Design a protein around this ligand. Structure first.
Ligand SMILES: Nc1ncnc2c1ncn2[C@@H]1O[C@H](COP(=O)(O)OP(=O)(O)NP(=O)(O)O)[C@@H](O)[C@H]1O
Ligand SMILES: [Mg+2]
Length: 338
């Protein structure tokens, strides 16, 4: 039967901008029951329930072990899996996906997924595994390869019933171990479009997708074809807060439009009346199409600011996250016999 997309909310500690503005804590949580509340200046609260609720003291270790670990186990079995970080600029999407390599509890989703996969392949002798990685970015409505030779070359999207939506000409890289995956992640990080604003000095100016392909040849002949999409979206932002001008501002209009398209896809999927879903409104929603309503086990990590200054932006993240938990997917094991 169909299963829901799983949603977790992560509230990061205050940033310097928020402390200088003398803002107050407007986010509350009861983690053991997945509860999150948002308080307005008058005191009125809006209550929500999610699959996970992680507060200012939460670690990447906790988040991964609780919600991501089962999904990565599903990819090893032959399922398609997707983890995507969503939220306002500077909320903690890149920190949640990449993290800090030198602090064990602070390592992100992506490096932990590499360790988990290669430990599972190393402890299985009756299945031979081949692991490939790809890494792309959607920058100003152009799909670009972050591991290719021409990072400026616009790539085209193709569709096929047995493959879903894919990127034609996207380079594929064999990874025999965790260092190989890390070398690609480093190379890709250097090529990703980034830029400074008053909301985030290290703002991601594109949506990124790191895909790990897990192919397993079983002793009963058959080939399992698991695939893990690790998605670090760009975030919603406002010119009055970022202070963005020129090219930085042009990126903001394309980022905001593509994120509005994702919101519209989420809303149409759960309104109970939309016969057609607007996946083609952006390259982002076309590449997330199979993850939202399709053949995939999906997790959204909705990141939020704890500050009263970001009440409106945090409320928007929570409303879309609340809607996303009702999206119904039909994941199946991808397994080609002989
Ligand atoms: N939970 C956290 N604990 C400590 N530092 C954090 C946390 N979350 C984020 N940060 C830091 O806060 C800054 C902004 O976070 P970042 O993950 O880059 O935001 P983002 O959601 O990806 N923003 P953007 O790319 O502009 O849409 C970085 O310096 C992070 O390392
Ligand atoms: Mg980021």
């Amino acid at each position: 039967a169909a299963e829901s997309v799983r949603v977790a909310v992560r509230c990061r500690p205050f940033n310097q901008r928020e402390k200088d503005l003398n803002t107050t804590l407007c986010v509350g949580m009861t983690p053991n029951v997945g509860q999150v509340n948002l308080n307005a200046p008058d005191g009125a609260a809006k209550d929500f329930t999610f699959d996970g609720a992680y507060f200012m003291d939460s670690t990447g270790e906790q988040i991964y072990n609780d919600i991501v670990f089962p999904l990565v186990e599903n990819v090893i079995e032959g399922y398609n899996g997707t983890v995507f970080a969503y939220g306002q600029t500077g909320s903690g999407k890149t920190f949640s996906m990449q993290g800090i390599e030198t602090i064990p509890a602070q390592r992100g989703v992506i490096p932990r997924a590499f360790d988990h996969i290669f430990t599972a392949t190393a402890t299985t002798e009756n299945v031979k595994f081949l692991v490939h990685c790809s890494y792309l970015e959607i920058y100003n409505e152009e799909v670009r390869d972050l591991l290719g030779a021409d990072n400026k070359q616009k790539l085209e999207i193709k569709e096929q019933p047995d493959r879903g939506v894919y990127v034609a000409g996207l380079s594929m890289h064999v990874c025999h171990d965790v260092p190989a995956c890390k070398e690609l992640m480093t190379r890709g990080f250097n090529n990703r479009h980034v830029g400074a604003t008053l909301m985030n000095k290290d703002s991601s100016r594109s949506h990124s997708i790191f895909t790990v392909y897990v192919e397993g040849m079983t002793e009963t002949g058959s080939i399992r074809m698991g695939k893990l999409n690790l998605v670090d979206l760009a975030g919603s932002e406002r010119q009055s807060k970022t202070g963005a001008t020129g090219d930085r501002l042009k990126e903001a209009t394309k980022i905001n439009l593509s994120l509005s398209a994702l919101g519209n896809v989420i809303s149409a999927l759960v309104d109970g009346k939309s016969k057609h879903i607007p996946y083609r409104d952006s390259k982002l929603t076309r590449l997330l199409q199979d993850s939202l309503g399709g053949n995939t086990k999906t997790i959204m990590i909705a990141c939020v600011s704890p500050s009263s200054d970001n009440y409106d932006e945090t409320l928007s993240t929570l409303r879309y996250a609340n809607r996303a938990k009702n999206i119904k997917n039909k994941p199946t094991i991808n397994e080609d016999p002989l």
